[PDB]
Write a protein that binds this ligand. Structure first.
Ligand code: CDL
Ligand code: CDL
Ligand code: CDL
Ligand code: 3PE
Ligand code: 3PE
Ligand code: 3PE
Ligand code: 3PE
Ligand code: PLC
Ligand code: PLC
Ligand code: PLC
Lengths: 183, 80, 149, 155, 192, 137, 506
């Protein structure tokens, strides 16, 4: 979906010329009445790599943050500001953990995503190492709700759709674990 | 300016030129609908526009068929 | 008896596809990677001595609306539409650089300048009849007429 | 320099002076192209391509098809430029000044994790919600096939 | 205003056929043989060409039977539908309907049947086929889907009327009936 | 999705059009240089039709007309299949049955124009044969 | 039942061999289909239940007791029209074989009945545009069904262009409405009936006014009706007004919620102007169909006053008038299709060219019908006397009921003009009666054997040979006595119209 909108960046600078788009900044920070939070600094690829571990660790707060939006009855942004900081702090907690426990396993995976069009199907060898590491050092697991355990896609031993080109760092790191761990 | 009916000067002197003006006139209606639908982020307006383009095509085909048979009706000696 | 003289044009047409593809794959990948190295030109060009092996970023395809929100979000963090960063805490400049584009909502030029497309029973009333606009102007006036209460 | 104005001024100049049917069919193509191009940028890329596929590819080449069948037979520079200039002065289609001078934005949100093209939604509603509109259309198309043959076929 | 009990605001197509009275089959038969007869009656009224009676060619009589075969069924279908809506005599169908539903709730199956259609598709399907028999003289449209917007309250199938307790059917609370809206949104509030 | 790379391509192709026209106008030798007998305008012999050498001076079949006319209804049928393509999964069986019905009604038109043989050119004017019958007295 | 049988007729007609007997027999298959449609419609649809109004097909179509009245009327008038093409209107093979030369005639008519019956029910601007095209496209095809005719094709070309502009105005009003509100369903628009530009609904009416031939747009309708074959003019000059006037009445029902006076003044300007042209126009005419085209415009002007007033008595005035005017229109055209057998034959001056498409074309071709057939002359006299408004025929009660609705709402100026315009129009209805009878006593004993009817072969010379076919005669007689003897059951009929509701209730 690459539809033009009035809410973000469009396809070309010729769209901007027709719309006479002004990219407007607002220097004003938030008022002191709202206690500050440390915003998450991860980019697209690290978030998609750690998305299922944020789901495993912040599940209660994410559900509660959304349930505040459902029951705010249209005043969601203003009446869920405190519950929206727990989620930001919880997610920052996970990315800080992966940087201090599985820095190389994490970086290898989201370098693969940045190498393969941000698709999970192309990075199973790196992803399997990261999941195995996270389990032993943080107990988090990746689970896809709504299906039996035996039929999750990322555990599929012989997938139908496989990457066209291999990630060298993934294949090298994988076979090393075939010696370090598969004793 | 158009209140003096300027668009009558802009339409040619053949029956086929009238047919084109009808299409250019309807084209303005569809462009107006696409404009509103995209601003409102409403796909119902885009359903309307899709219907207008399809219905405006059927109108052209019937009109040309009448015009075509109108033309051959004069050239209908065919006694060779 | 394979004629090699006949297959010479094909080996040149094979090179035609390879020439275009080889350039596009490498040039676009290099440009995307270089701009994803840092927020200034003295960082993008040079490679540090203590920096490790370079991890190129391949061009992205088949995107959706989340990739337009992710791209601007990455821009506000690194200065590139496809930057890389996995810091658990963002810079303090992240909270004062949100880009919200403001654009007009006027009808297309063709809808309001074509010698034929602009003529219509209702488009004249929008353009030459005050009936609609005087009625709506009442609601705008009564906004400021109700601040006294 | 919104050059889309200059394309229509040329177009508006030749619409006042066209004589034969060759130029009349040219005004059609010279009008869709600004319509398509101004839809490709700005508003809707999906309906710019639908217009090319359906208007140019289907209904425009039918005009030139029958013009070769029908026939091919057979003002003053001051008045034209005077008319075009007079036509050029007042180009405000609407008289809500604030609506035409004040800009607006929208706020995006991440609640829509199932992002799919507009043509996905249009098909989603046309084949479910308004399946009567879709079915009548195939009925209008059906009548045309019968309608064309009864009008034109000789015997 | 002849009003009766509303059995089903959008009766299902398979139900409407299974509820034909013998008289409804007679109307379907009469419509089937009426259209070929009407062609003959016109010829008796007035010969198509000439001045004397001439039986129409057999090919016309075969297409005439087909046209009257649908018309007879459509008349039969609409008459059977009025009973469901309550516009006609429906006491006989009410007991027959109640026997099936009370049996259905008893087996913990849905009265309306299981459906391939998701929640939006079920509700959308109901909108198209509800009250669609009013224009069944113009173009056909039938409720062939197991949706749940039938314009009834399933509570009314719990109380026992005359001559029903002898059925000795046990009805569980609706919360435990498979494939009902009151028994699906248990995990998430937007997924069944 | 960015399209500033696409825009430069369209602009370059637009520039490539002016180059193709004018490169001929700047590389051809001057008419005086070759033979001087005239420009394309005055040399009406060179600026004329080709009729294989001999100078000479459209009542097309109705079947050709119906081919073009029937193209338009069958095109709008094909172009209205586009919404179903990108939504085949999410409309499920319901939208699939509607799509098939949308095709059946149009097929009844295909049957109608197949039985009448509307597209056949036919030969009503010629190809006649007769029986020689003697008329003895 | 209509749609399903249409497909069977489409396929079957393209299989069997091209012949007149098979074409006439297929026309009798459609006469069954329309009859079957009425039996299924009346079975499920009832006045008592459709009173509230019922949404159908995702609220796209809304049906109530006012719309339901016209669907049954449309089906009835479509039966009386198909009787013409399905049986003999004269019995002379030369004149009649025109009705059987086209196999798609009945198919296109069945296409239109689907278009006509769905138009009053529309409840969405998206389906309003689609349905109005389905009806509009069917009329152009029927106008050009006789593709060999030069005048018929010239009329369809004129019809297509005017209707295309008419449809564009209709399409543009809906787009403008969608621009203001973003809603397509008519019921959702009613929530903003006070917040939208009510003149954009008037731009919608200006498109529907073109399609009913209302002045200043009346010019094309008069030209079209005076060029098409009399069998074609009998259909295209009545049916569109049946389904469009019902739609106009509903749109005006919603409009009068905000009771904008400026809207009423413009429509009164068009109604007033149309009465003038509808009356003074027909004074100087020679063609009968041009005369009935001006007659049609005047009656549409009367029916708009009932629509414009739009009260509880306006439903009664419109519902009664639209029924009686259809039967009168069918009766008059059926007679004109029959009395062509009494035309003389030459054995000269003024070189009047007659064709098989309009054998009766001039008013003075009705001459001496009092002599050639007295019984049918009175039937034409009674029908014309109804149009004049002589009581106690059906025509008087139409004008009397319209006047009640008009004056009860303060339309004094229009009520007086319609009574002036009625008397002015009586001049050219009286000319038809002058031609029918006034020269009877000079021509009473004349030696006439050159009539067209005298070229009919003699069958036996012993058996009685009726001059007119059976079915057409029974229709003319039935509708002539219904016109004449409405006084007997008028009270029941009018009380049967009090019940037709359009959200009156209580
Ligand atoms: C293909 C691989 C064949 C192969 O590798 O060996 C033969 C091939 C040389 O063929 P050759 O030297 O003529 O064979 C020896 C006799 O002269 C061969 O002389 P011959 O005439 O006796 O060869 C007879 C043989 C035909 O000769 C062959 O063997 C060709 C069969 C390959 C068929 C598919 C290609 O049989 C036929 O004639 C019937 C074959 C055609 C049947 C239909 C085609 C099948 C598909 O070896 C090469 O691959 C090198 C030349 C190929 C071109 C490379 C350079 C291309 C131009 C780049 C710029 C320089
Ligand atoms: C099957 C054959 C058939 O039904 O009629 C034989 C019919 C007679 O062929 P014929 O030998 O040339 O007829 C000579 C007689 O003079 C033709 O006159 P006829 O009276 O002998 O037959 C004409 C036929 C009227 O023909 C139809 O109505 C066929 C309608 C199908 C569309 O009238 C009837 O006979 C009524 C009985 C059969 C009508 C079927 C009505 C139920 C629909 C199934 O053949 C067809 O009309 C073929 C139409 C089927 C086209 C293919 C449709 C495929 C649709 C499904 C594909 C995707 C799933
Ligand atoms: C100008 C514009 C013109 C517009 C009009 C143009 C024409 C359009 C009108 C055509 C119909 C419009 C509706 C089509 C759109 C809806 C499609 C749809 O809903 O798909 C969902 C629907 C799935 O929904 P579901 O929740 O799984 O419901 C399951 C059964 O459909 C229902 O389960 P059940 O409880 O009813 O019973 C299951 C079992 C019956 O079980 C029993 O209870 C036994 C009944 C004894 C047999 C009764 C006599 C059989 C018929 C005589 O099988 C059946 O007999 C089901 C009825 C279907 C038979 C054929 C219906 C022909 C109607 C036409 O897809 C289908 O299965 C439809 C199958 C029928 C094919 C479509 C019929 C037309 C072709
Ligand atoms: C890539 C460029 C393609 C276009 C190259 C031609 C450019 C020349 C300018 C014409 C196009 C401007 C658009 C308005 C249409 C005007 C057409 C017209 O009036 O005739 C132009 C052409 C030359 O005749 P001219 O001397 O100008 O007029 C008097 C002749 N009796 O009369 C002729 O018919 C001669 C053959 C011209 C055929 C052109 C077909 C119509 C144009 C379609 C292609 C361009 C689409 C429009 C794009 C621009 C839109 C503003
Ligand atoms: C079965 C479907 C087709 C019906 C064909 C069977 C039939 O009815 O035959 C036509 C009937 C007698 O056949 P007949 O032509 O006289 O014998 C051959 C002489 N050459 O000739 C007749 O008199 C017509 C009798 C029609 C009988 C009903 C046909 C119903 C067709 C099925 C409709 C639903 C599909
Ligand atoms: C007409 C044939 C009707 C018989 C049939 O096969 O359709 C019934 C079928 C039901 O399948 P089922 O799995 O039992 O659905 C309930 C699941 N909870 O329904 C289905 O699952 C699919 C129905 C497809 C049949 C449509 C094919 C007809 C052609 C369409 C036009
Ligand atoms: C032939 C005439 C057939 C008349 C059939 C009229 C009819 O059956 O419906 C009457 C209708 C009332 O119906 P409704 O109020 O909705 O509720 C009852 C439905 N069961 O009442 C209505 O509102 C229908 C309005 C139209 C009525 C037109 C008047 C009928 C004209 C009679 C024409 C007779 C022509 C001669 C026929 C010759 C046949 C060879
Ligand atoms: C593979 C291959 O041979 O690729 C080598 C290429 C091109 O091969 P080619 O034989 O011309 O391909 C053409 C194949 N036809 C015969 C099907 C057209 O040539 C060089 O790079 C040297
Ligand atoms: C339950 C009551 C049903 C009554 C019958 C209805 C169907 C009529 C067919 C009868 C048989 C037939 O057509 O017989 C034939 C007769 C006589 O024809 P003829 O003019 O002498 O032709 C010459 C006959 N030769 C060949 C012997 C010389 O036709 C009629 O008299 C037709 C009467 C008109 C139809 C009445 C219908 C009234 C509709 C009212 C609702 C609005
Ligand atoms: C790319 C193609 C490469 C090969 C072809 C080049 C030949 C064209 C050179 C040319 O035209 O040189 C000759 C010219 C002028 O002499 P002319 O004979 O009148 O030129 C004919 C063309 N005019 C008259 C249109 C200019 O000299 C120059 O302007 C020198 C710089």
């Amino acid at each position: 979906s690459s539809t033009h909108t009035n809410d973000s960046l469009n396809s070309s600078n010729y769209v901007d010329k027709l719309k006479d788009t002004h990219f407007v900044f607002e220097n004003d920070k938030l008022p002191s009445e709202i206690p500050d939070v440390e915003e998450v600094g991860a980019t697209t690829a690290p978030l998609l790599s750690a998305a299922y571990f944020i789901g495993a660790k912040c599940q209660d707060y994410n559900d509660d943050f959304m349930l505040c939006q459902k029951e705010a009855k249209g005043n969601g942004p203003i009446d869920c500001l405190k519950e929206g900081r727990r989620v930001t702090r919880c997610a920052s907690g996970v990315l800080k953990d992966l940087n201090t426990h599985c820095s190389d396993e994490f970086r290898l995976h989201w370098q693969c995503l940045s190498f393969s069009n941000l698709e999970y199907k192309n990075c199973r060898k790196a992803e399997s190492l990261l999941n195995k590491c996270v389990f032993e050092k943080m107990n988090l697991v990746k689970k896809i709700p709504g299906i039996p355990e035996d039929r999750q896609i990322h555990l599929k031993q012989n997938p139908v759709l496989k990457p066209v080109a291999l990630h060298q760092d993934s294949e090298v790191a994988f076979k090393k674990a075939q010696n370090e761990n598969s004793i | 300016m158009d209140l003096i009916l300027l668009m009558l000067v802009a339409v040619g002197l053949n029956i086929i030129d009238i047919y084109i003006m009808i299409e250019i006139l309807i084209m303005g209606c569809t462009v107006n609908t696409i404009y509103s639908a995209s601003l409102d982020n409403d796909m119902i307006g885009l359903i309307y526009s899709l219907i207008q383009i399809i219905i405006a095509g059927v109108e052209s085909a019937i009109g040309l068929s009448i015009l075509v048979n109108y033309n051959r009706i004069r050239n209908s000696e065919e006694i060779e | 008896m394979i004629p090699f003289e006949a297959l010479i044009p094909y080996a040149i047409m094979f090179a035609g596809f390879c020439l275009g593809g080889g350039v596009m794959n490498s040039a676009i990948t290099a440009d995307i990677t270089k701009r994803a190295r840092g927020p200034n030109q003295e960082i993008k060009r040079n490679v540090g001595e203590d920096e490790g092996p370079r991890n190129y970023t391949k061009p992205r395809y088949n995107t959706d609306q989340w990739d337009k929100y992710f791209a601007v979000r990455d821009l506000r963090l690194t200065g590139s539409l496809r930057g890389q960063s996995d810091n658990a805490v963002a810079e303090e400049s992240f909270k004062t650089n949100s880009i919200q584009p403001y654009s007009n909502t006027r009808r297309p030029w063709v809808l309001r300048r074509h010698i034929i497309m602009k003529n219509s029973p209702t488009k004249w009333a929008r353009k030459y009849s005050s009936r609609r606009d005087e009625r709506e102007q009442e609601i705008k006036d009564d906004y400021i007429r109700g601040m006294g209460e | 320099m919104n050059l889309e104005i200059l394309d229509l001024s040329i177009l508006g100049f030749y619409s006042l002076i066209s004589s034969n049917s060759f130029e009349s069919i040219a005004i059609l193509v010279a009008t869709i192209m600004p319509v398509i191009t101004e839809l490709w940028y700005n508003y809707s890329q999906l309906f710019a391509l639908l217009y090319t596929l359906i208007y140019v590819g289907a209904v425009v080449i039918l005009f030139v098809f029958i013009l070769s069948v029908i026939n091919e037979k057979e003002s003053g520079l001051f008045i034209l430029i005077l008319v075009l200039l007079l036509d050029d002065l007042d180009d405000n289609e609407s008289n809500d000044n604030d609506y035409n001078n004040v800009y607006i934005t929208d706020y995006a949100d991440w609640f829509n994790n199932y992002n799919e093209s507009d043509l996905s939604v249009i098909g989603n509603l046309l084949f479910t919600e308004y399946a009567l509109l879709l079915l009548i259309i195939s009925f209008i198309l059906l009548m045309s096939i019968i309608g064309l043959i009864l009008i034109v076929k000789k015997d | 205003m002849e009003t009766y009990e509303l059995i089903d605001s959008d009766p299902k197509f398979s139900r409407v056929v299974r509820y034909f009275r013998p008289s409804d089959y007679l109307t379907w038969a009469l419509g089937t043989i009426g259209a070929p007869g009407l062609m003959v009656l016109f010829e008796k009224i007035e010969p198509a060409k000439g001045n004397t009676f001439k039986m129409p060619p057999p090919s016309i009589m075969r297409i005439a039977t087909t046209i009257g075969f649908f018309g007879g069924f459509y008349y039969a279908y609409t008459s059977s539908t009025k009973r469901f809506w309550g516009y006609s005599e429906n006491a006989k169908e009410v007991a027959k309907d109640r026997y099936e539903v009370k049996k259905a709730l008893s087996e913990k199956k849905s009265p309306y049947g299981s459906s391939l259609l998701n929640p939006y598709q079920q509700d959308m399907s109901a909108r198209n086929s509800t009250n669609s028999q009013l224009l069944l003289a113009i173009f056909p449209w039938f409720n062939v889907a197991n949706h749940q917007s039938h314009g009834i309250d399933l509570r009314k199938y719990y109380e026992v009327r005359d001559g029903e307790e002898n059925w000795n059917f046990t009805l569980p609370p609706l919360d435990q009936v498979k494939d009902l809206d009151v028994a699906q949104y248990k995990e998430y509030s937007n997924y069944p | 999705m960015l399209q500033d790379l696409f825009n430069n391509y369209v602009i370059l192709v637009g520039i490539l059009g002016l180059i193709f026209l004018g490169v001929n106008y700047f590389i051809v030798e001057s008419p005086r240089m070759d033979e001087n007998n005239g420009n394309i305008s005055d040399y009406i012999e060179k600026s004329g039709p080709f009729e294989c050498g001999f100078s000479s001076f459209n009542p097309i079949p109705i079947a050709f007309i119906l081919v073009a006319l029937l193209f338009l209804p069958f095109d709008l049928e094909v172009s209205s299949m586009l919404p179903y393509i990108v939504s085949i999964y999410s409309v499920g069986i319901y939208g699939l049955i509607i799509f098939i019905l949308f095709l059946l009604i149009l097929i009844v038109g295909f049957i109608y124009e197949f039985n009448t043989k509307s597209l056949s050119i036919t030969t009503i004017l010629h190809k006649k044969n007769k029986a020689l019958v003697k008329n003895l007295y | 039942m209509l749609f399903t049988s249409l497909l069977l007729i489409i396929v079957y007609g393209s299989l069997v061999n091209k012949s007149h007997l098979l074409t006439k027999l297929i026309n009798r298959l459609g006469l069954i289909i329309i009859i079957y449609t009425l039996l299924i419609h009346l079975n499920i649809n009832t006045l008592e239940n459709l009173s509230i109004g019922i949404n159908m097909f995702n609220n796209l179509l809304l049906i109530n007791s006012f719309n339901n009245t016209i669907i049954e009327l449309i089906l009835i008038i479509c039966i009386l029209y198909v009787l013409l093409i399905s049986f003999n209107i004269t019995g002379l093979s030369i004149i009649d074989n025109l009705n059987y030369s086209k196999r798609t005639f009945i198919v296109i008519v069945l296409f239109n009945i689907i278009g006509l019956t769905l138009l009053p029910l529309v409840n969405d601007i998206m389906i309003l545009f689609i349905i109005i095209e389905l009806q509009s496209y069917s009329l152009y095809l029927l106008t050009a069904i006789f593709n060999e005719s030069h005048n018929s094709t010239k009329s369809a070309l004129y019809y297509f262009i005017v209707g295309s502009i008419a449809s564009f105005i209709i399409l543009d009003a809906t787009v403008s409405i969608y621009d203001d509100l973003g809603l397509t369903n008519i019921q959702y628009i009613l929530m903003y009936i006070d917040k939208l530009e009510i003149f954009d609904l008037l731009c919608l009416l200006f498109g529907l006014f073109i399609k009913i031939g209302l002045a200043p747009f009346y010019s094309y309708s008069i030209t079209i009706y005076s060029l098409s074959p009399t069998i074609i003019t009998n259909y295209i000059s009545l049916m569109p007004k049946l389904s469009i006037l019902t739609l106009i009445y509903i749109i005006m029902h919603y409009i009068n919620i905000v009771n904008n006076t400026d809207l009423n003044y413009v429509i009164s300007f068009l109604i007033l102007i149309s009465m003038f042209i509808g009356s003074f126009g027909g004074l100087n005419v020679i063609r009968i169909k041009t005369l009935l085209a001006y007659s049609s415009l005047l009656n549409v002007s009367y029916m708009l006053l009932a629509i414009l007033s739009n009260s509880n008595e306006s439903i009664i005035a419109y519902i009664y008038y639209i029924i009686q005017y259809s039967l009168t229109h069918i009766n008059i055209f059926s007679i004109i299709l029959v009395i062509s057998i009494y035309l003389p034959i030459m054995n000269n001056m003024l070189n009047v060219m007659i064709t098989k498409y309009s054998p009766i074309e001039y008013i003075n071709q009705l001459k001496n019908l009092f002599i050639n057939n007295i019984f049918i002359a009175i039937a034409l006299c009674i029908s014309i006397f109804s149009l004049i408004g002589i009581p106690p025929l059906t025509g008087f009660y139409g004008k009397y009921l319209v006047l009640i609705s008009g004056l009860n709402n303060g339309y004094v100026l229009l009520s007086i003009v319609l009574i002036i315009a009625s008397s002015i129009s009586t001049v050219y209805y009286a000319t038809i009666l002058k031609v029918l009878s006034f020269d009877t006593l000079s021509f009473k004993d004349i030696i006439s054997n050159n009539l067209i009817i005298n070229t009919s072969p003699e069958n036996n010379n012993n058996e009685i040979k009726p001059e007119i076919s059976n079915v057409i005669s029974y229709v003319i007689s039935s509708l002539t006595l219904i016109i004449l003897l409405i006084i007997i059951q008028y009270e029941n009929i009018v009380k049967g119209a009090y019940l037709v509701l359009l959200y009156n209730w209580v």
